[PDB]
Structure formats: structure tokens, C-alpha cells
């Protein structure tokens, strides 16, 4: 563990300093179906001609990135994603750009969003939630050791793979920062109090968001919800959280230490760091090594009828990919 994170940092630093660039072209792919939309872009299933592999292609309209003031965030997203390598992070296979758009081509995770299965089933049992939570704990351990904050944990950005394991996607708000940072970004239900209160914040916001995720997985609904974000914010800063009757005492004790408004007391941010979380009683039955090596049997395995099957994804309205004869935002995205 201790020595693995040292070797991992060296490969990351090499790619962080000299990122890959322009490793494919749009005409090398056939576009098939939209897998998902987000706040900023669209992700399509594509097939790579020479090879026949299916991939998931994220498409960002440069003008829309500019209008929403996401230039720096989008450059972080590609720079960080092409440099990381971890069993529970989507792999970036190609990236390129044209006159109008930025493209990131990822491995296709056919099992669908955690969001869809969680809403359909209603809630996950604690052993089921724990299996997923352990993968996120290890993923944040790895990312934080590289000085990375993720800042957008939620079931909509978590994908289930063929073996039933998690793949974290969407590095849109990820940032490499050694001190504090100040950007107000993320999803209202998952925002830590210190973000809302315009305090400088650090990697501890990821551990708060983990608490929210575990709650929502096990309860079926977020700990703080309302119809308008403003009322969500008021509940988050008040810190008062109620637990469902069926939560175990161990689960409630862990969540009280993750959903801790006081930065100095929040698990993950203390002297022992992530080991406070790994050593908690709720994880007593968790074999961290076996999870990392993907040797544990997944509690739920999605159905697949073949390569290119999208049945675990919702349908979306398809739109044409337009490319202008004139280059847009050429040098804003020079390093992409």
C-alpha cells in the first residue's frame, strides 16, 4: 500500500507534466447512440472502425464551455484524466479536437449509472452499499495522494462494469491543488458546508460527499433534500441529520463522523487520514486487498446481451454533431 502509492505518483507526474494530445480523429469512429447528457456535454456510444471496439465519446462544444466559464475546469478534466490509472477509474483511450468541439474517448462501461439501478431498486442493503463504498474509499485514497480533489461524487457519475464493480467517471470539477481552493461547484445535495459558506476548502469535501453517497445508497434518498437548492443549503449548514430506522448502529456512527460539519473532527481529515475510515467497525468485514484486486464477488451483476448493448442506459434525444468551417476558441484550448 505505502510503496504502491509512491510508484503510482511517479507515472502520474510524468503524464501530468507532458500530457498526450491529438491521439485520434473523428472519422475513425462511427457514432451510434447517446448514452447520457450532463450539464456541459454529451456522451455517445461509438465504434472504432479499424478495431471494432466500442467506446464512450464525451463531446464538449467549445463555445458552450466558454459561455459557462469552464475553460480551466475542462483543461483540468482532460489533463488529470489522461494521467491517472486505477482499477475503479474510467480509462481515457483517445482525445482530440476540431473546429467546434473537444472529444474525450473512454472505455465503454456497459452496466449503466449507479443512479438508474438505485432508483429502480429503491435502496441498497448495507453489504451492497459497503461493497461500493469500499471502492470509493480506495479511489479517494489514491487521488488525494496525488493532490487531487474530485468534487463531484454522485450516483450519476458512477458506472457499473461487467463484473459489477464501480468505474468513476466525470472529472469535470477535479483539480490538482496543494492548499485551499474556493470555487463553488458540484451538486447541491453533495456540497460540504465549507463550500456553501465560501470558506476556502480542501480534500475533506470528498469525504463529506462520501457520507452523502453512503446515506443515499442505503436509504434510497439523500440526507438533505428539498425542491430548491437554497433550502438544501440551509439544511446542510445546520448539520441536523436523521437516519432511517433500518440503519445499523455501525452505519450511523460512521455517517456521523463523515457528515461532520467541523473540519477538525471529520473522518478522512484527521491525523490518521483514511485509516480512520478503513478501520471503522462498519468496514470490519471488508478485505481491502481483495477489493482492489477485484477478487470479491459483486452483489449485483448487470445483464449484457453483447458488445454495444445500451439496454442499461436511458434513451436520450439524438442531436447532430456540427463542425464549423471556422475554428472556434483556438488558443483557449491550445493545450487540449
Amino acid at each position: 500500500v505505502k510503496e504502491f502509492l509512491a510508484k503510482a505518483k511517479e507515472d502520474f507526474l510524468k503524464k501530468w507534466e507532458t500530457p498526450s494530445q491529438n491521439t485520434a480523429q473523428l472519422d475513425q469512429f462511427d457514432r451510434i447512440k447517446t448514452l447520457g447528457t450532463g450539464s456541459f456535454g454529451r456522451v455517445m456510444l461509438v465504434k472504432h472502425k479499424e478495431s471494432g471496439n466500442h467506446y464512450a465519446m464525451k463531446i464538449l462544444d467549445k463555445q458552450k464551455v466558454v459561455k459557462l466559464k469552464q475553460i480551466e475546469h475542462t483543461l483540468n478534466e482532460k489533463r488529470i484524466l489522461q494521467a491517472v490509472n486505477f482499477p475503479f477509474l474510467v480509462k481515457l483511450e483517445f482525445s482530440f479536437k476540431d473546429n467546434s468541439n473537444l472529444y474525450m474517448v473512454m472505455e465503454y462501461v456497459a452496466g449503466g449509472e449507479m443512479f438508474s439501478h438505485l432508483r429502480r431498486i429503491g435502496r441498497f442493503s448495507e453489504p451492497h452499499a459497503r461493497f461500493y463504498a469500499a471502492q470509493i474509499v480506495l479511489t479517494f485514497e489514491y487521488l488525494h495522494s496525488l493532490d487531487l480533489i474530485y468534487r463531484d461524487l454522485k450516483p450519476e457519475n458512477l458506472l457499473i462494469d461487467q463484473q459489477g464493480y464501480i468505474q468513476v467517471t466525470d472529472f469535470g470539477f477535479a483539480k490538482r491543488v496543494k492548499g485551499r481552493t474556493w470555487t463553488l461547484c458540484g451538486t447541491p445535495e453533495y456540497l460540504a458546508p465549507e463550500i456553501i459558506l465560501s470558506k476556502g476548502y480542501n480534500k475533506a469535501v470528498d469525504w463529506w460527499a462520501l457520507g452523502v453517497l453512503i446515506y443515499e445508497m442505503a436509504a434510497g434518498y439523500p440526507p438533505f433534500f428539498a425542491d430548491q437548492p437554497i433550502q438544501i443549503y440551509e439544511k446542510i449548514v445546520s448539520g441536523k441529520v436523521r437516519f432511517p430506522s433500518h440503519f445499523s448502529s455501525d452505519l450511523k456512527d460512521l455517517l456521523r463522523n463523515l457528515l461532520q460539519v467541523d473540519l477538525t473532527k471529520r473522518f478522512g481529515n484527521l491525523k490518521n487520514g483514511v485509516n480512520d475510515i478503513k478501520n471503522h467497525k462498519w468496514f470490519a468485514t471488508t478485505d481491502w486487498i481483495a477489493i482492489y484486486q477485484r477478487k470479491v464477488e459483486a452483489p449485483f451483476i448487470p445483464k449484457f446481451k453483447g458488445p454495444g448493448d445500451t439496454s442499461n442506459f436511458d434513451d436520450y434525444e439524438e442531436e447532430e454533431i456540427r463542425v464549423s468551417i471556422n475554428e472556434k476558441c483556438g488558443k483557449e484550448f491550445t493545450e487540449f
Partner: peptide, 19 residues
């Protein structure tokens, strides 16, 4: 119930980010 209140709320679908 809390579940009923959530399911009747406007934020049961996929959630977008704030910026």
C-alpha cells in the same frame, strides 16, 4: 414518510451541477 416526501419532490431525477 421521508421516502414519500422525497418521491413527491422535484429532485428525484438526474441532478445537474451548479456553477
Amino acid at each position: 414518510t421521508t421516502y414519500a416526501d422525497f418521491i413527491a419532490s422535484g429532485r428525484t431525477g438526474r441532478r445537474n451541477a451548479i456553477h
